[PDB]
């Protein structure tokens, strides 16, 4: 649990598989997968001490184009978790109002733009 | 500096101390003068004046 | 030889002098504030 | 244009004959307004060397932290451009996307140059004499404005001799020797 | 740099140490030597060419070295340069004399 | 009375002794505190070849920008190869020639 | 040369105030670094700061000799002048013959009607790099003052316990083969400046059996300078003492040339301070 290379390599090992044997360790980490590595590691260090209202600023897209990313992408994971719902195999466990985090999620860059949940459900 | 000694042998016993003005000037006494006996060179912080009156205090 | 020998005596007893209070002052201050908190935690539960 | 009512403000927001999104704020004709820029293309044209010099400091950011081909280059692209006098400081390589600006290019113009070595009191009189034909920097005359001029190049910038803005300075100070024709 | 024109062969290279561009260069009557001016470095830069060395740098101009020429007889060095000045080197034989014209 | 600064050392054989058992200690050491004279990844290469292509073109338009006055690239002591080979056939086209040596020294060869 | 000189100094002294205004990005960039070193939480102001982070990024590629002598340290050979004070008597004549034969690289130039701004002009167009003037009184030399040239510091130093080697006796003649350098106890940071001063007017990489030596040895404030020469025997090693000794106390570190006294002081020697004999490289 205090390892902290397998572990890095462990939650980055969705966007390796999304830009990439394999090469892990940085020093040997090309580019847009360094980019959001980096970014990545750099939010999940700062969202100990930062604002929860300062840390993850999304992107500023307009309201009817956003809704319909939102809505896009909900049929995306509702399509891929109904698609296999009824199978057997270990679908990892989401949260109640979050968004599951699938491939096209991490290839599209959806989280930046939509958030990882409606946080207006979530205050209410 | 004028009269605080009588003679260079005085000046010499007491060369190095640290003197001031009345102002707070601090100084130092660095070398008697020939010729005017108890007469002596001292440095200071700036230019003092002409109306003060430095300053050895002893015990 | 005497300002050589008047100068160095002088900053020993400055240089002890300091240590000497410095150290009287922060053992008042960890071994009697360390009973001042000790003091202050078992009044909190009250 | 003619200051829209209540209803109809509301019923047309997006309306607006002067200002528009591809004109990203008007701001080629805003530092072209500021460094006196005679021709409209020149903001682009320096535009396109921004974008090169941010194109590659991005691609060169995106390699490994630690390698000497991205620690080379980075460091050479930031020693050519602080020469060049387009960036102010060769410290930091966040330099390379932030400090890399059509503005600092046009600070290099020769006017712009002139007017902070305090040889004419404004870059549009700077301009009137570089293209009336007083500069010129080493021995050559000098005669547009849109030349840049180095750090070390900018040592040689002066007037021309026989010119009547180095004669009314020279007998200003009453300094004029007419020997050597100024 | 030095190019043989029998063996068609770039055979010498000549840098300084500082980076800086050249603008002017002269080479020796006897050539054992070359040397060469910029215009943003204000000295001479003289190489022997059977070494390759940076055999000395003179110094002593206050403006860009405009031109140099070794003399074909006697071969002595001018130099001149944008402070309104040419200058004449002895170079050869335990002079390094500086004769300057105004 | 008090005094403003020390006064200057006096230099007995006692200072000289202990500074040359100093110097002695040093220069058997030999402790002397003198100036001293002055393939990897198919990604990564094509990377590399990506930004040097880049950097090529963004040199030569700023050198042209800022009008051919700069600040060469630093130094390259780089490996050339050279086949043996008429300087007849290291020309130009036309019906002339200047010299018809090899391009290799006796000594080369 | 007089322009882009000035010039030069202008952008070297706004690069350094740049530096020491924004020297703050470095050290948090610092604790950014070592944050994704070992993997512990970044505070809240290196937290909430969103560009910082994405100026990272680029600059996560950053990473002795100082400012002045940087550029060209074992590049390139000294070149000194030594210089008397004005009028110079004779035996400040000689000690100046002496500092020129302790200098290698340094020859020496008779002063008489030569004023200091166009001597510091003359020195630095024809391209030396350090003069040292020489102060007496009565015979007696009392300061020496380095001056290292393009806009380079001014050490000024008095000197104490002379003794001349014109004094002593016909012990022969100098060695003049580039000596080994011993600095001892030069601790701070004025004695790694002091150090740097010192030192890059000596010629760089002496032989390793380069058969003489010269010491700096710090004592309290007071660099005592002796020049040796040495033979190594069986046993120990056996040093004779070769030309000048004496002490040299800096009480001025200013960061011109010798001409302006405008200049910034780096450091000067406050006499007359409270706490002024309670400390070494005050």
Same mark, same amino acid.
């Given at each position: ?105 991490? #290839?599209?860059? @959806? ?14 | ?59 | ?46 | ?19 528009? #999104? ?31 010099? =941010? ?15 991205? %620690? ?20 930091? @390589? ?45 021995? !050559? ?42 | ?21 050249? !603008? ?56 001149? &340069? ?5 200058? @004449? ?14 | ?22 110097? %002695? ?11 001293? =004279? ?28 800022? &009008? ?11 490996? +050339? ?17 200047? /010299? ?10 | ?9 202008? +952008? ?48 996560? /590629? ?95 130093? /008095? ?13 022969? !003649? ?43 040895? *710090? ?29 040299? =106390? ?9 001409? *302006? ?11 007359? @301070? ?9």
């Amino acid at each position: 649990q205090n390892d902290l290379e397998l572990q890095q390599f462990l939650r980055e090992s969705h966007l390796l598989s999304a830009f990439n044997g394999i090469v892990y360790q940085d020093d040997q980490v090309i580019g847009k997968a360094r980019s959001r590595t980096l970014e990545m590691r750099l939010n999940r260090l700062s969202r100990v001490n930062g604002h929860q209202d300062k840390i993850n600023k999304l992107e500023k897209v307009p309201m009817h184009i956003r809704r319909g990313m939102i809505d896009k992408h909900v049929k995306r994971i509702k399509k891929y978790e109904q698609e296999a719902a009824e199978g057997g195999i270990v679908l990892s466990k989401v949260k109640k109002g979050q968004f599951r985090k699938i491939e096209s999620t991490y #290839k599209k860059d @959806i989280e930046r733009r939509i958030g990882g949940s409606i946080k207006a459900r979530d205050k209410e | 500096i004028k009269d605080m000694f009588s003679s260079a042998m005085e000046v010499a016993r007491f060369e190095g101390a640290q003197i001031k003005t009345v102002s707070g000037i601090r100084g130092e006494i660095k070398r008697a003068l020939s010729k005017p006996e108890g007469h002596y060179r001292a440095a200071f912080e700036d230019k003092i004046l002409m109306s003060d009156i430095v300053i050895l205090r002893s015990w | 030889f005497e300002a050589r020998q008047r100068i160095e005596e002088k900053n020993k007893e400055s240089s002890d002098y300091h240590a000497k209070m410095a150290h009287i002052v922060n053992t008042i201050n960890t071994e009697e504030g360390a009973e001042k908190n000790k003091y202050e935690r078992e009044r909190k539960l009250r | 244009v003619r200051k829209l009512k209540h209803h109809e403000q509301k019923l047309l927001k997006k309306v607006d004959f002067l200002e528009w #999104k591809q004109d990203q704020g008007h701001r080629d004709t805003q530092v072209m307004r500021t460094y006196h820029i005679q021709n409209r293309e020149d903001y682009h044209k320096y535009n396109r060397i921004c974008g090169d010099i =941010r194109r590659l400091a991005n691609k060169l950011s995106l390699l490994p932290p630690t390698d000497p081909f991205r %620690r080379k280059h980075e460091q050479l692209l930031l020693d050519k451009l602080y020469a060049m006098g387009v960036l102010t400081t060769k410290s930091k @390589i966040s330099d390379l996307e932030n400090k890399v600006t059509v503005s600092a290019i046009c600070r290099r113009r020769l006017p712009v140059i002139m007017h902070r070595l305090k040889m004419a009191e404004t870059i549009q009189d700077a301009v009137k004499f570089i293209e009336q034909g007083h500069v010129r920097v080493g021995p !050559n005359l000098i005669n547009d404005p849109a030349y840049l001029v180095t750090r070390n190049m900018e040592d040689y910038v002066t007037w021309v001799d026989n010119s009547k803005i180095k004669k009314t300075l020279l007998r200003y100070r009453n300094q004029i020797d007419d020997f050597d024709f100024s | 740099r030095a190019w043989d024109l029998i063996r068609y062969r770039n055979f010498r290279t000549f840098t300084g140490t500082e980076r800086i561009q050249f !603008n002017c260069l002269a080479v020796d009557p006897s050539g054992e030597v070359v040397c060469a001016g910029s215009l943003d470095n204000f000295d001479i830069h003289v190489w022997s060419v059977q070494t390759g060395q940076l055999l000395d740098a003179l110094s002593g101009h206050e403006g860009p070295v405009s031109c140099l020429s070794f003399s074909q007889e006697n071969s002595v060095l001018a130099s001149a &340069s944008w402070d309104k000045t040419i200058r @004449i080197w002895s170079i050869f034989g335990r002079s390094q004399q500086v004769e300057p014209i105004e | 009375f008090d005094r403003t600064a020390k006064p200057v050392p006096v230099i007995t054989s006692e200072v000289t002794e202990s500074l040359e058992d100093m110097i %002695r200690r040093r220069i058997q050491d030999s402790n002397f505190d003198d100036l001293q =004279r002055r393939a990897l990844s198919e990604e990564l290469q094509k990377a590399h070849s990506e930004i040097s292509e880049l950097y090529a073109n963004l040199v030569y338009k700023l050198d042209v920008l800022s &009008s051919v006055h700069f600040v060469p690239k630093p130094a390259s002591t780089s490996l +050339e190869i050279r086949v043996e080979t008429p300087t007849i056939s290291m020309e130009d086209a036309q019906p002339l020639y200047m /010299s018809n040596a090899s391009s290799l020294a006796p000594q080369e060869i | 040369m007089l322009r882009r000189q000035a010039r030069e100094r202008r +952008e070297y002294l706004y690069r350094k105030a740049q530096e020491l205004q924004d020297s703050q990005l470095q050290q948090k960039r610092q604790i950014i670094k070592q944050a994704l070193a070992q993997g512990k939480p970044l505070p809240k102001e290196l937290a909430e700061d969103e560009s910082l982070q994405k100026d990272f990024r680029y600059d996560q /590629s950053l990473k002795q000799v100082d400012d002045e002598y940087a550029a060209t340290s074992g590049i390139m050979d000294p070149r000194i002048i030594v210089t008397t004070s004005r009028d110079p008597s004779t035996r400040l004549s000689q000690f100046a013959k002496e500092i020129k034969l302790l200098f290698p690289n340094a020859v020496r130039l008779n002063r008489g009607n030569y004023v200091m701004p166009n001597l510091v002009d003359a020195c630095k167009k024809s391209g030396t790099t350090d003069l040292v003037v020489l102060h007496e009184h009565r015979g007696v030399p009392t300061s020496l003052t380095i001056s290292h040239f393009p806009h380079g510091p001014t050490a000024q130093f /008095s000197l104490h316990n002379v003794v001349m080697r014109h004094d002593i006796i016909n012990a022969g !003649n100098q060695s003049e083969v580039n000596p080994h350098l011993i600095f001892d106890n030069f601790t701070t940071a004025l004695g790694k400046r002091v150090v740097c001063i010192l030192k890059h007017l000596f010629n760089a990489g002496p032989k390793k059996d380069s058969e003489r030596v010269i010491t700096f040895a *710090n004592r309290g404030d007071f660099i005592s300078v002796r020049q040796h020469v040495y033979v190594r025997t069986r046993e120990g090693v056996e040093i004779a003492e070769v030309g000048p000794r004496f002490e040299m =106390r800096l009480f001025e570190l200013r960061l011109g040339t010798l001409e *302006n006294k405008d200049a910034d002081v780096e450091w000067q020697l406050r006499r007359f @301070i409270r706490t002024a004999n309670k400390k070494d490289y005050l």
